[PDB]
């Protein structure tokens, strides 16, 4: 052990397309690491790049085929499973 870490969060992103639903895209980002030490969750959607970033570790880019806004973006973090559900 010299430069190995376990406190590093390992997220896993899953993407799913929906047609005719309240959401057109479902994105699943769960935290699955040996340990990981998440602090806060401050996601934000930048219209400039049309990307919804979760934290300064990973960002979720939206396809330009979809019109997405802060009012359409549904972000819910379940602590029970340490999973972050994104519905757009």
């Amino acid at each position: 052990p010299h430069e190995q870490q376990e406190d590093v969060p390992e997220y896993e992103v899953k993407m799913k397309r929906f047609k005719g639903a309240a959401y057109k895209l479902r994105i699943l980002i769960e935290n699955k690491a040996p340990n990981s030490k998440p602090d806060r969750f401050s996601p934000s959607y930048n219209f400039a790049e049309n990307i919804l970033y979760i934290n300064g570790k990973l960002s979720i880019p939206l396809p330009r085929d979809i019109v997405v806004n802060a009012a359409d973006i549904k972000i819910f973090h379940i602590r029970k499973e340490r999973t972050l559900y994104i519905y757009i």
């Binding site: 969750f41 959607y45 930048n46 919804l52 802060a70 972000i75 819910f76 379940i78 029970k80």
Partner: peptide, 23 residues
């Protein structure tokens, strides 16, 4: 350019409300 970015409020729930698709 269109330098507009908005923060999205995240709700920390134990699961999504009815109507959502959870797996």
């Amino acid at each position: 350019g269109p330098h507009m970015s908005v923060q999205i409020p995240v709700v920390e729930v134990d699961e999504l409300p009815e109507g959502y698709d959870r797996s």
